[PDB]
């Protein structure tokens, strides 16, 4: 993302593609490396009644 406009034009022409739209190096679009804590759901057997193991 630091290439001069001339070099950007040069490599786009040589490749035939708009390379700047799909750079293979990652910048700020990637997710933060610190995330809020999750709160994961529980499965269908997490019940207080009508849940005898012999029926599942």
């Amino acid at each position: 993302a630091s290439a001069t406009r001339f070099i950007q034009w040069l490599r786009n022409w040589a490749s035939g593609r708009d390379l700047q739209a799909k750079l293979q190096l990652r910048y700020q679009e990637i997710s933060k490396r610190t995330q809020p804590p999750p709160k994961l759901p529980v499965g269908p057997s997490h019940k207080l009644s009508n849940n005898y193991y012999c029926t599942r």
Partner: protein, 176 residues
Amino acid sequence: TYKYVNLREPSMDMKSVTDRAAQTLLWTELIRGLGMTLSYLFREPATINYPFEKGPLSPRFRGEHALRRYPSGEERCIACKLCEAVCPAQAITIEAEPRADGSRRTTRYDIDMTKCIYCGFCQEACPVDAIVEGPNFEFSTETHEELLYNKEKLLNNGDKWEAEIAANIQADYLYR
């Protein structure tokens, strides 16, 4: 559903035949290949400046093992041997006895780091978060023997890395 990768009929009109003749004689597709490698020459390379820069890792990373403590300094391990039982490589060897104060503690805790497959099963199995795979991966040695960890080495790893280990557990324990 399917598609044909290579089932097409070349057009046999004079214009198309002459187009293929020009490609054969003027090497057009070969020149088009030169353009691709030329465009890469002028792209920023993907190389990082190791060891001044490091590849990104996550809190789940499975690296060098360590034995952890409670905040008071007491060992977490209570010699249950669940880690030893689950170890797919049989890399763990444990012996235990009552401590002088009656605590259930190990007298031997060895990990053969050259048997270990760094799978993380031991730290899944542990009920007290005693054995963990820490974040360190830069511990290559000059001799085979240095990779046969006894309990003193593993407790030293825990004391050395606990600051990072605790923070990584803090980030991931809600997924566990």
